């Protein structure tokens, strides 16, 4: 019944395609978990549903409508099941509203303990692969992205910023409500969500040939000296960027610099920015992610290398196009996995899927590839992965089918050398 991920079986619902989430977050005290919510989800179908199956993990529902009518429903362990007057049936799209509150709950497999951060007067979102269904029902899987609609209620001495476009800001009884609109659909650990003594400041329109990029960043209070965002940095990267993958996914773009020390997060059009990760290569990576795991999102969790991979190869780019010798440091990276192990792409375990070949083997498997065809053609095809994984979520076999239809034969048994295979392969070279 759920997604069947293969690394985290119980998450999601099989067949759910959530389409719009419209969530009201009420954060009394930033930095501090508690919360309430209430959202309503659009949510239509891929095989007929009799039960919408939700991931929720620490707020305690207290009510529910299925299209503003009364509707039952159970919270378990870690789920809330609604159950349907009728089937939902695929064609047909219905509004889950749900009243909650709580306290979000956040494993040594992971990298992070992922989920509703709380730290230093903030409260955030940081929450790849799982931590989403801490403070949101939803369907907590890459394979169903979704929009999303964020009013963030908070104290009227703090502030809030969450992905997409923000429209309008109210106070009343000392509390202020901040809008957010997010218009292209992203995962829902892309959401990004973040609460506390924080400051907007935007930058002038990215103009790229197909459309305009707006430009903000968020500044938390506190920040080591010395944190920015270099002055034109953003816009040259969405230029390179966008020349190499096709057209930015999204409105805006930015960052969200935070005293914190944690991994940057390429939350929507707004990369959650952990001061200690603000290096040049992590906001290139970050950006780079909004078309890889944001725009073409993961199948399975087993792939996150078409993440990882595709955005930190997305760096060499970056690098050479500001005249770095690209091959120095692919074997750079080489040298560095010549002395770790390795790994088939393909994880098959939780501990694997943030690991140093999801990274760098994925990255060298795209390199790989680009020196067997050529720039023109990898180019070429990066535009044509992208437009073929908009709105349908990726796998590696879907890539190397892809990469045999496109780029022939040859091609495709050069990245399979790469996705395959236990022992690391020779570093590729021209
Ligand atoms: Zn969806
Ligand atoms: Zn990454």
Not at 124 to 139: D, K
Not at 207 to 214: A, C, F, R
């Amino acid at each position: 019944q759920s997604v069947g991920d293969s690394i985290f079986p119980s998450l999601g619902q099989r067949g759910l395609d959530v389409q719009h989430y419209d969530l009201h977050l009420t954060v009394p005290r930033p930095g501090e978990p508690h919360l309430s919510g209430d959202v309503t989800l659009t949510v239509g179908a891929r095989e007929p549903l009799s039960r919408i199956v939700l991931d929720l993990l620490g707020p305690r529902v207290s009510a529910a409508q299925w299209n503003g009518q009364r509707v039952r429903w159970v919270q378990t362990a870690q789920k809330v099941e609604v159950t349907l007057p009728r089937p939902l049936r695929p064609g047909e799209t219905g509004r889950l509203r749900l009243i909650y509150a709580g306290t979000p709950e956040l494993d040594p497999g992971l990298p992070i303990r992922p989920g509703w951060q709380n730290e230093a007067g903030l409260s955030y979102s940081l929450s790849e692969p799982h931590g989403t269904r801490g403070f949101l029902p939803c369907n907590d899987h890459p394979s169903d992205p979704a929009t999303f609609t964020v009013r963030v209620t908070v104290p009227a001495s703090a502030s809030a910023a969450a992905s997409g476009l923000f429209t309008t800001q109210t106070e009343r009884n000392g509390l202020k409500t901040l809008t957010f609109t997010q218009r292209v659909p992203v995962p829902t650990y892309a959401l990004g969500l973040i609460v506390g003594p924080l400051e907007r400041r935007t930058a002038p329109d990215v103009q790229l040939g197909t459309q305009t990029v707006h430009r903000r960043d968020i500044y938390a209070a506190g920040l080591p000296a010395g944190t920015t965002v270099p002055e034109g940095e953003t816009a040259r990267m969405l230029r390179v960027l966008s020349d190499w993958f096709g057209p930015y996914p999204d409105e805006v773009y930015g960052v969200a610099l935070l005293p914190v020390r944690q991994l940057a997060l390429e939350t929507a059009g707004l990369t959650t920015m952990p001061a200690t990760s603000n290096r040049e290569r992590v906001r290139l990576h970050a950006l780079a992610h909004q078309w890889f795991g944001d725009q073409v999102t993961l199948a399975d969790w087993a792939d996150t290398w078409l993440s990882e991979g595709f955005a930190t190869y997305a760096e060499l780019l970056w690098a050479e196009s500001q005249g770095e010798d690209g091959q120095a440091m692919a074997a750079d990276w080489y040298a560095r996995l010549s002395v770790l192990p390795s790994r088939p792409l393909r994880a098959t375990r939780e501990e694997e899927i943030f690991d140093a070949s999801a990274y760098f083997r994925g990255a060298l498997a795209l390199h790989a590839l680009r020196l067997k065809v050529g720039d023109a053609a990898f180019g070429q095809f990066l535009h044509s992965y992208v437009k073929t994984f908009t709105g349908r979520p990726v796998s590696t076999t879907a890539l190397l089918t892809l990469v045999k239809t496109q780029l022939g034969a040859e091609a495709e048994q050069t990245l399979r050398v790469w996705v395959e295979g236990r022992t690391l392969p020779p570093l590729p070279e021209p």
